[PDB]
Amino acid sequence: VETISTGSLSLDIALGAGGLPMGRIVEIYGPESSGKTTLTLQVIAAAQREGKTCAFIDAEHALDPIYARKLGVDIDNLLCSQPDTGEQALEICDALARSGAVDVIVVDSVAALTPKAEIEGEIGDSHMGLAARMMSQAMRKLAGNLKQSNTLLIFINQGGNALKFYASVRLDIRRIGAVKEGENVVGSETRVKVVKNKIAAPFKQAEFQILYGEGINFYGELVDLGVKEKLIEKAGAWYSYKGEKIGQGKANATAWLKDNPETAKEIEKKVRELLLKQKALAAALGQIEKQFGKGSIMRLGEDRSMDVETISTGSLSLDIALGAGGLPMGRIVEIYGPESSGKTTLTLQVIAAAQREGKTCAFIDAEHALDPIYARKLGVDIDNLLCSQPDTGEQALEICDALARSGAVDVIVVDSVAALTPKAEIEGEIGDSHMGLAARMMSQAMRKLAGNLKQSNTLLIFINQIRMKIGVMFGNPETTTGGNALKFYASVRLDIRRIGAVKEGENVVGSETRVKVVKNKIAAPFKQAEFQILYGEGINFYGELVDLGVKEKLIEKAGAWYSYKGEKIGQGKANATAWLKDNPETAKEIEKKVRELLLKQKALAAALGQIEKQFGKGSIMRLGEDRSMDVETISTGSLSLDIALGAGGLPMGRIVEIYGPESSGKTTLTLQVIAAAQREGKTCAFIDAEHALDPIYARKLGVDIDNLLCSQPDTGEQALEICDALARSGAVDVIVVDSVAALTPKAEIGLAARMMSQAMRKLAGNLKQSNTLLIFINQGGNALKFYASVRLDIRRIGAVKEGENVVGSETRVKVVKNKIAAPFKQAEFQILYGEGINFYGELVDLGVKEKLIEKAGAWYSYKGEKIGQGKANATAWLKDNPETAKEIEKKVRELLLKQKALAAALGQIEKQFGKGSIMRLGEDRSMDVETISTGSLSLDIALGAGGLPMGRIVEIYGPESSGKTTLTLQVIAAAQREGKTCAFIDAEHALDPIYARKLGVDIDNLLCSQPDTGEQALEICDALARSGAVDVIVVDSVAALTPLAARMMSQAMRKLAGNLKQSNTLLIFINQGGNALKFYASVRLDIRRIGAVKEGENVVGSETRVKVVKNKIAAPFKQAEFQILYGEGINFYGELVDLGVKEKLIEKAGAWYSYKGEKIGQGKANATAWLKDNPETAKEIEKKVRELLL
């Protein structure tokens, strides 16, 4: 029968037929990127140059028109099938088989022929085996509709045992080499095996080459074939054709048969024999059209764009490649693209053009992104934009359903696929927690949206991304790494990328983008559009505009010059661009010229409140709305934050996430609300996983530290669970959690962001019935993103200088999630070291924009009265008379806005978990434990307990040469001082025994180790924990215990935890590291050297501050200062003097120190070494302070 040339010579040869059998089914299978599609596009070429009109059944949405062109396909005369489903696909190809004169059909690809079933939800029992049965189905029916037409059908594969037997021929293409030009990639040595042949002989294989951007090289193989078949003679290097010399090497031998057409064709043949009407279409087309919905197959080179309604993308060159001149009103559009590609700009740009034509639009936001200010420069009327911030994946998808059945919502924008994270994930509900399974949630409420949008003319847009990734792999792009469904139910599909970026000299102010239209059931698919996107300006309207008035000779390219009807307009695209900018109409007409040359509040105001009734109160609104749901508010501290919050403070009994980088301000603000609350009565709780909190700073910020509740939990879980019952009290009005990331679970004591998901939903409710406001802090797990009622974005931007001195951080808070009022509004303000949020600073600014204070360029006036010059000097004038302040304070507010349950539920928590893991911070109440003296005095006072808790864990940390070691050795000393024997695990290979002696240890009774490995050390002290009364152990230092330098720890950390509470044995770790321990301590210390003690000229000291950071023994966050004398040790008398001062026993007369009216010392210095010389009257003060703080 009839045969079509493969494009390769030897493929034809191994086929036995000199081509691929017409009227049969032919399968080409093999690893991806092996030349599958090239070989394909090659037969479409060889047949295309013989009339034989061809069909391309496309589900890959791949195909490079350009690469095709150079392979040699009459693109303008090719039929492609952009099917709606795998079924429909496997029927359109059938329908063409029947229609006589449609010659060869190509399906791309078997794998992407995803069943109508999958496109929805559901299931089978030959399943994913559902395709192998959609195959088995309309296959017989095709098998015979081909021997009818001589119609050749070619299937491309990599899943369906039916196709196997109905194929008359099968090919095993694989990339097995590569071809070089000395120093380059350019080649791909390919190997094709004939597996199935009922046309001649099977099992024969044939080899050839593929060139990047040129295709199969049969001339290449021709030479080689002429070699073995006598016709061509090889004289070593110079190749021959019987006397007539042809070239040098294989490089020129091939390069010659290119210049000589006729002589080649001759040899071609001589080898072959030595081995081996137009309305049957056009009528039968409109047929498949009417039969399956209008436009779902076509020739590619067509001026036919149906006149369905068009909305401008913002880019001319996009509208152009769309075909229709805008996006299809009443359809689904997926714009996918690599993160930070430009997608959303283009997205906001459609919102732009539609809003400028009277229409009103929807924004379904699961990203919490959207820069209002940028949108406003972009062209979007933010005030009228309908914004939705859904509680969840499905819930989001269902809010569209009903914005479709409105009709006067014109365009819906969904941000974005990947971020529409479903219920099951939000709860943590396992089995397919396996996130990327609930893509079936897409397939679900998808089907229905199709209709609801079409009979509204509501245009909907989806945004996606793609996977290559866990984090970083090197596998390959699978179209749309959201869900399988959308891939078909989209009427049009966009691939925005980024390739260039552009410059204003050396600045980077641009981004060169490329949008590919890959799925197009409006017109010409696979058309593309390059243009520019400018930071803070938008799409380069004029940019592309020029480029078009090039090709449609309206603006004349005179090399580097740009002319408009004789008169010169710009040199270099640069100025041309920006010329049109200043003569708008001349452009907007040239616009129109290329567009000629290539192309009630009745129903709304009602269907709005319809969703608020059905889907939780206020789950959508115009962004410009004044309407705040009236629920009670706690002031953030920053007026401008309150304001942009919408409600005037944080929502009561709802969850709030404040996040940001480290050192942003997130805590200052956090502490500020705890303040503002405490000064209204309402009492607060602080759950601490961070052990951060500066008491002194809080005190100066305005926090009643004494009456604040602190909880230093052992496990994240436990932490949360504490909030649980702190919610069921109604007497904790504000809980603060520092911080999400640090709430590391028991399991870890990576994956368990699940813990966050857990007791989340239960805690959500308990707060509305308590007004218990809970605030989280992040830098976390997916659940919070949603259950939060308000999400805050603090970042630090600038700095504040007093003359020339860094005394402040200029901050910016952005309300990115707001289900209490208007979202996306922002507020900027000052934070000052040691004073906090700058009330007055923003107050001035407010009164300027609310016209109470008058800006005379640089001068600041308050009605007649001139109150300052330069923001600063004015700021600090309201600080000078709070009279006028408190008046303007309010006038701006006006222009923009028992102890039964407590004193009981407290101890309940102590009983439920651990005794003493919550308390008031200003508490005498210490507990009973054996306490070793730390060596200090004020330390053992700041501990509250008398010293370190026997048989718990204690971590001391801080910078190198801080005094870490010394401190410990001072403890070992004052254990030695009462029998308690000691071992000192000296991993560091530190310690100068000599020095040690000088500090006061019994050198000979401190039996100690110099371990080789981290482990040895661990299991050494492990065995000393069990070893009865060996009474305290110091590990110096966690440092040389990088061998999972915490997975190793978390091991024996569990073990030493319960071997100590047994032996009373106490363990002190030192650090500079390795998590777990952080929690497994009952006390933590922050040492730091901050001074130095001189004796005129000698560095003989180190002034030292130790903060009690973690204290599950008594009151935490207390601090103590003292002198450490090099080669003597801590200063008994040093800190003693000081204590006796603050306890009215020794009296400070400026520089003079007094005792019973008696002069004892001038300058702390001499005062000290006085008490050294009067032990009697010293020891006597010792006690009387010990009586007053122990």
Ligand SMILES: Nc1ncnc2c1ncn2[C@@H]1O[C@@H](COP(=O)(O)OP(=O)(O)NP(=O)(O)O)[C@@H](O)[C@H]1O
């Ligand atoms: N735009 C292009 N520029 C240069 N070379 C290309 C281009 N497109 C394809 N190629 C070449 O062809 C590729 C082979 O695979 P191809 O012919 O596209 O079949 P395929 O395996 O079906 N592709 P896919 O199904 O997407 O994995 C590469 O090895 C390149 O050599």
Ligand SMILES: Nc1ncnc2c1ncn2[C@@H]1O[C@@H](COP(=O)(O)OP(=O)(O)NP(=O)(O)O)[C@@H](O)[C@H]1O
């Ligand atoms: N404030 C801004 N100033 C300058 N350019 C901006 C600003 N905001 C956004 N852009 C532009 O928008 C970016 C393109 O990405 P965008 O349009 O946000 O799509 P996106 O990929 O959805 N972002 P994301 O979803 O966060 O990964 C940048 O390349 C900028 O061109």
Ligand SMILES: Nc1ncnc2c1ncn2[C@@H]1O[C@@H](COP(=O)(O)OP(=O)(O)NP(=O)(O)O)[C@@H](O)[C@H]1O
């Ligand atoms: N002891 C202090 N002295 C001076 N300034 C301080 C002190 N403690 C905090 N600050 C200020 O607060 C910081 C801002 O970050 P902060 O309010 O601590 O939130 P944070 O990011 O949660 N801290 P962290 O959890 O350690 O990353 C700095 O910018 C300082 O302006």
Ligand SMILES: Nc1ncnc2c1ncn2[C@@H]1O[C@@H](COP(=O)(O)OP(=O)(O)NP(=O)(O)O)[C@@H](O)[C@H]1O
């Ligand atoms: N041989 C010595 N004689 C006297 N004083 C010393 C001697 N060695 C160190 N010092 C001082 O006293 C030390 C106390 O610091 P130290 O207790 O070693 O802290 P550290 O953090 O454990 N050091 P490192 O282990 O290197 O991180 C430092 O302050 C030194 O300045």
Ligand SMILES: [Mg+2]
């Ligand atoms: Mg392809």
Ligand SMILES: [Mg+2]
């Ligand atoms: Mg966005």
Ligand SMILES: [Mg+2]
């Ligand atoms: Mg803090």
Ligand SMILES: [Mg+2]
């Ligand atoms: Mg040391």
